[model samples]
Target: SHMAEFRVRVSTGEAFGAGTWDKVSVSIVGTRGESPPLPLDFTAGAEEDFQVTLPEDVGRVLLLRVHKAGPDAWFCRWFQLTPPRGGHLLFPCYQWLEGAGTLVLQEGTAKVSWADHHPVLQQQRQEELQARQEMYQWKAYNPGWPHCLDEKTVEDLELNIKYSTAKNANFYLQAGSAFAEMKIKGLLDRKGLWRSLNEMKRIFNFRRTPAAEHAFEHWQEDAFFASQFLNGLNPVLIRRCHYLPKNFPVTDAMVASVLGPGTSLQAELEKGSLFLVDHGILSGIQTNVINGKPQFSAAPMTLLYQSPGCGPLLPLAIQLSQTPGPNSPIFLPTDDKWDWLLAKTWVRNAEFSFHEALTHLLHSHLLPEVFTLATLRQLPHCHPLFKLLIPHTRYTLHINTLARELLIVPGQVVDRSTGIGIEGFSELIQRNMKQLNYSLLCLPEDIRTRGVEDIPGYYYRDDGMQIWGAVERFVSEIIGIYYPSDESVQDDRELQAWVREIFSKGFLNQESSGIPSSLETREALVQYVTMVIFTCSAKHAAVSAGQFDSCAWMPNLPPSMQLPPPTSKGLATCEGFIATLPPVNATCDVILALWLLSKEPGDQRPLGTYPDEHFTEEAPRRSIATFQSRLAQISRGIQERNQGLVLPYTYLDPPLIENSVSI
Candidate 1:
């Protein structure tokens, strides 16, 4: 009994032109009962193609049916190669959408200002100078992927984190821009994703700091802040300070936590288990933007990735969005301009290359079966899909058993492999593609059974171009508003405090907003948090989201080589930023040469201001005593519950923070 047959059906259902459709058929080639191989011929049909059923208990024999159509018939079929199980159609789906699209016989070309690749890089003169002046100790907080927490643009992590949440319109707008970026990049498949992002960019730009307001903004201008934003969008980097050394679990721990305890996932060491952890994504939640405006708007999402137990994450901070209000937040679309933008945004199918990627790797049986604390026990993984995802990295495969029991998924099957999801995650697609209305891997009917509604027909993921611009603009604006011309006179200092106050309130009242008339207590409490964060991190060297300490950002790409002249020509300027980043040292001493902390207790850099440029010419402006005092306090706070440690200690350094947290 070596023959296994299968049936294919096409349910066009109004989406692909409903009514009556014609059928085309032709050749079938695959193994047939006990025979080596043969082609099964079928006549051109007027009927709805053909159908057949395949049986199991056979050796490894694949079935194939080819339908030919001149450049006309680019074929695709979602086939049920196996019987239904776990309420799914139990099929192997395939497609060919690229039959007719851009087909050029030559490579594509474009010219842009860019950097040459290198194994390592050097810090350009300008960046080094700025780092020396503004960057303080917070850089030693969260250490991972250059401060990016969630770098994936296409997939969503089923996240539940504990971040220091904020409600400032500008900051929430930044998060919204991050989400919108994912949609435009084809990460999200919801409605008006692109347009929404465009709106956000405009919003962020509107609120940006002028070059003369904030100290950091005066130096770099646009480009400087633009780079700052990319890092901010991804928490995998900046959220480090939100975590005290005791409970902060970065990406490594979050992935480990996904696998339930006893999975020994945390101990895998060389080949760790892959867990499917989804970050908590946001949509419309009512929130307070600046100036009493509230409507169905984007709320603030949390940034937490910490743990109370070893289970999954428990989100500590939250920034709920306010309903639509008047002072008009930036970049949001006007209802008038939406109809057309929404129309062009509909992408029925992905590009051919993307489709192939999806069919061959992304779209697999493993995708439909997402594992949580529950599903791990039910489904018999070891399917073809599971092998690609978890593979030999898991327990050894039971090769002698049936195909259903085939375990080892080779790593090479995918075009790209990253430590995105792991442990207990039976299916990868289900991890990113689950419908909001449905639970993780329930049977198809279970979605209907459990009453999960389909997303609206018009739901497109995101408006890509809009989002990128919005966040980039927001960073520029923020910097300009805070740090203006050093040589001029303006309310730059007051504005800096204003920003600090806004962010501080966002974090404290973030969770406690539930209090009725506690607006005063809420105001007071948030002020207190504002004081701590601002005094310690926000606006300081270790700015929010692991953002660097600079008001300078390269706003535009200049044509000239060496250094494109500064944006604020008249303002006091340093050299200039390189379009390409400087080489990040894998290891470097915490340049303790000079500065504020070295002074007597009172001489320590004031909690919320830049340090004086003293000691630059002498032995070293900063004393070992100062570094010992300040960083030690930070280190103590991070590790208090653990070892009762003090500074000049390791936690004060970002490198040790990452090294210690790693499993």
Candidate 2:
């Protein structure tokens, strides 16, 4: 049998302050049917040695307790150790640094366990454990080398965080850019995202904040919010005012009272447990202790639950760190790389990288395509393709407006939202992003399951460029109405060639060709691209999905919006809309959908019907092409006082519906 040596250095330097410990007696209490108490004495610095046989694969907790000398025979302070396979560990615990303490093996042998590691409170312990297990599960299934750049990224972040004396402003700016960049990267592979996240956590050695440490014992509620910003497609928001009751064994009545008059989490409550679902994630809270008092105010982490499309609700609960107090809502990492990079310093540089990428993507692909009036004017109108073009143009206008507002052009002045200097503004950009959602919508069935390499079709495409190819197919097919030649030319893959051509060689760019020379527009274009790359991809998917139901486009909107119900397909009736509306920000998706909710009833198609009829080209399936082609021909035949077909800029207006939710 293998044996391990164990010992601990007794603390004497003003330890466990605010109480007297001079009259305490010391001894060891070993469990697992092994050693009995080994009495010890401490003057200031004392040395003690002990031996224990190591079991096969199991471990035990050995406690060194200091008990009061007399009638008050209570345990005052405690230190612990669990022998490992063959070596020993010596470390300090509680109120003192491991470096401040000293130990020597004198006659035997030993090893050090955690020199810089520290404890996580009982409240966070379970969360850390669950997360640890889930991480291992993913690793066992598909492990590989981590991204090479991540380590350098983190090292840079540490320096920024260390020197962030200016109200952490420098660090946070990087965070904003980092979040935006990650969204731009669209890193949503579960195994990949989590692996990167775990890697960062490992390198950073994240732990509960001091506030979490002290208040964890007092936490009465705990839960986590999950779901990517989808890079602004569908944002996840939980108001600070949102919470469950502080009382134990809560009933349906109590839940209803706090959750508002109409809401009830009754069925979710079961004895000691209660859970709540909002957006796509389901969450719950648990409570903690110290100094003989029950303290349950804030936990360092909470459980996350997810239910996939055809699978049973996931058995494993994802663990995420929870803020220490109930006053602030849980916000997605403002960076695009939320899960992958957790530090503010890491957040900063990640953001910087995003801004630069945005500049390049716009300057390279999207902006050049729209840099002149010829491309915009020649683009087909009143066709299925027009839907995407209209939104893209409107977004371009918004960016142009923002540029003017920022005074990017030496002397340009405009009335517009500066899009900067607002608290949580960059975060808003990430939350409202939609790249992941669109990618999901267009992801081929095979790619969704297994892995991308499972099929050899798209192995070498730039990470997410494969989805762009899919969108191009969709756009190419739908633009059949404007095919000038035989409509069959649209399906002959010429459209694909056209799209590929556009992506590679952008449209004509000439200042003399009705395109502005405003430097502000140029500046705004990059910033806008940075902010809405997700939105740009999402618009195609969103238009493909349909306009009748906001939730169709954004599935993870708050569950409360699923009210007043609907027919098999239409949006919420007025009551549902009213319930969702009330406090309104100008840009919230709520207001946008609420407006749609108020529209006169039409034959709102069911979710998935629009894409099925249009994108699916199998025979007897009427596509957007068929619908628009016949309609265009009919309009031309119906003469209008000999006046030409009116081509107004109706589509350029800002969407009546907002893309994000209320603040």
Candidate 3:
């Protein structure tokens, strides 16, 4: 460890207009490592010296800051020390925005200067500061910074039309249901969407990419930052694994039948094709490399629909090729429909996710109460409880709104006149109604403003689940530190009881379904929220947006960084320095699943483990089915009636509702 000490100094240039200086403070003061804050007292025009001895055997960045308080004014300055070579000290990046300012010192004094403090850069600095300030305010739940294209071009519309099939029926059915709901909810109209599509097709033109080889160059530059979609295997996999047909003829009746189905679409349709089917590759794979560029090839495939007299939605898989032509179908004409799908699908899926998450929190067999510090202090010092102190503390402070919302107290009282209560509504269970309201009601606003991309990957991040990772950490640490040696309770009774208490019910119980107190009970409960988000967040984004093969969850990256191509082994292990994304969520899923599955076969607990059991038997799964059926019927009906429905509109074409390729 490189340890060194420093003599810190703070000077006062001039006194305030009316009053004398009172106190000065500096936080995170360090000589060659991290240390506690140091408070200073001094008079105007005077200086102070602090001899902070750097602790040996621990190397860390030395952060220095000076804060001054006077009668009516305040001042603050921060500094960072570079790695020491010998005696001379070097400091760098005075401003977070590099190239904006610098400070250079000789012997004991340093001078600060900016390259240029023009109007633009100054304003930018203020804006950046404002963003940070707003981020911390409870009222300013500024989700985060994420943006997308504002307009759609014709080429984009046509490209979406050409290949509308997603990876599987899971998303296809859900999307149709979502699209139908938009129309039913009056959020979108056929005429409104039609007009936009018409203009988009008319204005944009398709081009040839004779210089398509340049696309490979972008893999190194933009792959990790953006998306580098893999093509050849994508098509085969879509067809083989997802079974979305490559082609289909959609008539007016056919479109309505599939889109608007409440079992009216026929069990056969549900049984075959995309909805429920998978087959292996019947053709050979192809791979070729020419002039330093590798191209992958897949067997050409097609699908025909037959149902209700036959069907229309033939799932399509446009192949991915390394040496794709300029007019490659894989390359979307515009980023319109793709982005539109992402936003809407993200919002709709989030609604389901929000509902499911609350269901787990309020009604699950587990989770009646949060383990407060008082409850955890009984454990060993090195227990998971101690390990989570920092994150838990941070959660209470940084996520106040979430904390308040989730701090369920059943017997809460309300104001006499206002009828609003902080604790909870007396009649309601756990005061969860308010929390549920926020999840369902406030989500649209949150997604529209903040959306996803707040985390490393381009998809939305789960704040609740993110914190739960910390929870898992605490549990694991507790198990490791205390469980191995302590003989307090054999057979892990205390641990089991602790988990069992939380897992007992508040769920809306079912008449037909039998409840299991243990054994796969925990796994089934947590998976509802966890799995839905697991796919919705990143996996869906990657498949739908880029159609990339061997894709992994992407996190934040430094600009001008270089990395090799993505690989499953690299991402799974996090050994690939070429890219870095937090795999904690995935790790949580694995850990939690493992714990749940590890339940002893003989560990039988009573069904009525907790009092006031309220269960919703399979409601989570049932809800998805009901929703898909209800909305699918609506869109199906609309399309069937408008026979010549051509939604993938072009500029040259007039409005003619003809059934085109199914989405």
- C-alpha TM-scores of all predictions: 0.20, 0.23, 0.22
TM-score of predicted model 1?
0.20
Of candidate 3, the 10-residue stretch with the lowest lDDT total is 652-661
Q: What local lDDT score does residue 292 receive in model 3, on the 0 to 100 scale?
A: 22
Write one digit per residue (lDDT tens) for candidate 2, span 14-125: 2222133335433333334333333343332333343433332223443333334422111111233434444442222222112111111111111011111223222122
The C-alpha stretches of model 2 lying farther than 4 A from their native spots are 1-224, 227-374, 377-392, 398-501, 505-663
Overall lDDT per candidate, in order of appearance: 0.21, 0.25, 0.25
lDDT of 3 at 225: 14
* Model 1 agreement with the true structure over 1-663: per-residue lDDT tens digits: 434453443322121212222233322222332222222231111113234534333332233233332333222323223322322121222223222321000000110011112111112222332332241111111111011122221122111111111212333355355545543544223221122222322322322333212323322222222122222211111122212222222234333333335444234322221111112222221111111111111222222232323322222222222222222111111212222111111100011111212221222111111111001121112111111112111110110111122121222101111111111122322232332111111122222332212211100001111111222232233222222343211222222332333222222222332212122232332332222222122111121112111111212111011211112212222122221111111000000000111111111222212121111212221232343244345444445433541111111222121100100
Candidate 3 global CA lDDT score: 0.25
Candidate order (TM-score): 2, 3, 1
Question: Taking the tens digit of each residue's C-alpha lDDT, what string does model 3 give over 1-663?
Answer: 544455555443232321234454444433333354445433334545555544453233333444444333321112223333534332211111112121221111111112223443333334533443342221211111011111122232211111212222333354455445433543232211112212222111211121112222232322221211112111111111223333322232433433344432333334443221111121122222211233222222222222233233332222222222342222111223342222222121112112222322222211211222111222221122222221211111211222223222222111110011221122222323323221221222323332221212111123223322322332333233323333322333323332332222211222221222232323332322222222222122212222111111111111111122221111222233312211222212211221221121121211111111111123322332442343334334334533452221111011111111011
Q: Which run of 10 residues does model 2 get worst, by summed lDDT? A: 104-113
- Give the better candidate number (1 or 3) by lDDT: 3
Q: Which stretches of candidate 1 lie over 4 Å from their true place?
A: 1-8, 11-23, 26-61, 73-75, 81-91, 97-663
